[PDB]
Amino acid sequence: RDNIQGITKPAIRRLARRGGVKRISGLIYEETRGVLKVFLENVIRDAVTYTEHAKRKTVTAMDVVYALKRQGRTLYGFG
């Protein structure tokens, strides 16, 4: 469905500015898109597995929190 192109170049620039970066080469955007896709696939697979084990049709914030904690990425503020 080609929805990765919705992560636009100015958004990546804003993230890099929050990261303290001052100058950005023109090939960084495609690399960033690939890295983000890998990370998102890794998290969503585990979230869906938890949802399926509960015999549910709806993914929940606690599913997402458990999946994140499983990878050593604990997150506060969503239950």
User: Can you give the binding site for DNA, defined by CB under 7 A?
Assistant: 6, 8-11, 23-26, 56-58
In the bound complex, what is the minimum distance in angstroms from residue 19's beta carbon to other proteins? 3
Question: Do residues 47 and 64 touch, judged by C-beta distance below 8 A?
Answer: yes
**If you search the block for the tokens 């990878």, which residue do you land on?**
71
Question: Do residues 12 and 26 touch, judged by C-beta distance below 8 A?
Answer: no
| 9 near other proteins (CB under 8 A) | no
Report what 9 binds from DNA, other proteins, none; CB cut-off 5-8 Å by kind.
DNA
In the bound complex, what is the minimum distance in angstroms from residue 42's beta carbon to DNA? 21
47/1 Cα distance (integer angstroms): 21
5/25 Cα distance (integer angstroms): 18
Q: Considering beta carbons, is residue 48 or 71 the nearer one to DNA?
A: 48
Q: Considering beta carbons, is residue 17 or 73 the nearer one to DNA?
A: 17
